[PDB]
Amino acid sequence: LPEHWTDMNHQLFCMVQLEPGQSEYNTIKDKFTRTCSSYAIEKIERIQNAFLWQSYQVKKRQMDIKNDHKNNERLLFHGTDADSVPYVNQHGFNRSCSYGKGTYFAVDASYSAKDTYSKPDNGRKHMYVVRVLTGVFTKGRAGLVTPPPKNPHNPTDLFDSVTNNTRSPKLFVVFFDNQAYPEYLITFTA
Amino acid sequence: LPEHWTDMNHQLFCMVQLEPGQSEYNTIKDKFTRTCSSYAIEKIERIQNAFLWQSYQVKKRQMDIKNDHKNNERLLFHGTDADSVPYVNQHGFNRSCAGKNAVSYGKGTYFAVDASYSAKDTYSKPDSNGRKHMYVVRVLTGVFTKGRAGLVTPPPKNPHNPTDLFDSVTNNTRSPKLFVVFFDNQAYPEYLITFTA
Numbered sequence: 246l247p248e249h250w251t252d253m254n255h256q257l258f259c260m261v262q263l264e265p266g267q268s269e270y271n272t273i274k275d276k277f278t279r280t281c282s283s284y285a286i287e288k289i290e291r292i293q294n295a296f297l298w299q300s301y302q303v304k305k306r307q308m309d310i311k312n313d314h315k316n317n318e319r320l321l322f323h324g325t326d327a328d329s330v331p332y333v334n335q336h337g338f339n340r341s342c343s344y345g346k347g348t349y350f351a352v353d354a355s356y357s358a359k360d361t362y363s364k365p366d367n368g369r370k371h372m373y374v375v376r377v378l379t380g381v382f383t384k385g386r387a388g389l390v391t392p393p394p395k396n397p398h399n400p401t402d403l404f405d406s407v408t409n410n411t412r413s414p415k416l417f418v419v420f421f422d423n424q425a426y427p428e429y430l431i432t433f434t435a
Numbered sequence: 436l437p438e439h440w441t442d443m444n445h446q447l448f449c450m451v452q453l454e455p456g457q458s459e460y461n462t463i464k465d466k467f468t469r470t471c472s473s474y475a476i477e478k479i480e481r482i483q484n485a486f487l488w489q490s491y492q493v494k495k496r497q498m499d500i501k502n503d504h505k506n507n508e509r510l511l512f513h514g515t516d517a518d519s520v521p522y523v524n525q526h527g528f529n530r531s532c533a534g535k536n537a538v539s540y541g542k543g544t545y546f547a548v549d550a551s552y553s554a555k556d557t558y559s560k561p562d563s564n565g566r567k568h569m570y571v572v573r574v575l576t577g578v579f580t581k582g583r584a585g586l587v588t589p590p591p592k593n594p595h596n597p598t599d600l601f602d603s604v605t606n607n608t609r610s611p612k613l614f615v616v617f618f619d620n621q622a623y624p625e626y627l628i629t630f631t632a
């Protein structure tokens with residue numbers, strides 16, 4: 246449904262390799278090279294997953310209504326191993342597969358570039374650029390299974406995400422499916 | 436939002452007490468009493484949760500497209516403790532908080548075909564006033580297989596295509612008595628039955 250997606254022959258899922266030197270590739274490469282200029286990019290792919298996008302956009306609309314502002318989305322990074330890539334492309338990020346038991350996303354590509362996250366393949370590494378509905382956030386802590394409530398006497402009204410540091414966040418954790426949309430996959434080497 | 440819901444003015448959540456003798460109440464009562472005739476219903480509430488409904492209906496439409504038929508949905512029961520009711524009413528069922536079943540077919544949220552299963556004190560734990568609580572739930576069971584205790588998602592239909600998954604798992608494919616779901620917004624809590632011995 247986004248305007249910049251290309252035609253999919255009436256299908257619902259496609260990975261589209263970006264053309265180097267065009268505006269879309271350049272924009273994503275720049276976000277990566279801001280902190281990972283010593284790495285070599287092999288390719289960048291746009292993830293066109295209609296079902297995942299639809300469920301994510303429903304959640305975004307709901308969060309925009311609940312927070313009655315539209316500053317709920319951030320573009321973050323997520324490094325993972327090659328064996329998780331097919332699952333993420335098709336199903337997104339699953340907390341069931343410390344600041345809480347959720348899925349973690351980094352502000353800086355350099356954080357996700359650590360081998361503990363983007364585990365090397367032939368030494369190929371994989372990192373997603375992710376639209377994340379961080380919404381209203383608070384500091385996380387170990388053992389959380391959802392974000393904390395905003396106020397005790399209303400324990401069901403929750404923060405949207407948690408972070409390591411509210412003033413200068415470097416990571417965010419989300420605890421529900423469809424709060425994160427994998428937008429691009431970067432394949433790269435050290 | 437469904438046309439039979441009460442108008443919520445500009446609200447996104449409401450519980451609606453049903454009246455006995457109407458078909459909506461009586462049919463839920465009949466489904467419950469089919470296996471829970473020793474218990475007595477205090478009340479039945481319709482759960483009107485706009486956001487949960489929207490996200491669930493999106494998943495249902497997607498599953499109906501994927502499976503190329505239209506019986507992916509079952510009406511099942513879920514007994515729980517009073518302390519979980521506010522959360523479920525607002526946020527639905529969360530696999531990360533789910534109880535461990537006495538016979539585990541995976542790490543997910545469990546739903547019963549028969550109210551008698553959910554009526555056990557192990558699940559619908561009596562509160563300090565003797566009230567037990569059971570949800571009636573639209574569940575997207577889709578295509579299913581027999582589960583296994585280690586599962587954190589449904590298994591693949593084919594081991595050589597690991598991402599093409601069953602929609603849910605069960606205890607027994609020939610005579611299913613319980614279903615386990617592993618994703619958010621795959622189950623919509625539609626009614627809450629409050630009942631007693």
Ligand SMILES: NC(=O)c1cccc(N)c1
Pocket residue numbers: 322323324325349350351356357358362363416417
């Ligand atoms: N890239 C990751 O998987 C990641 C991002 C932020 C924090 C953590 N722990 C991991």
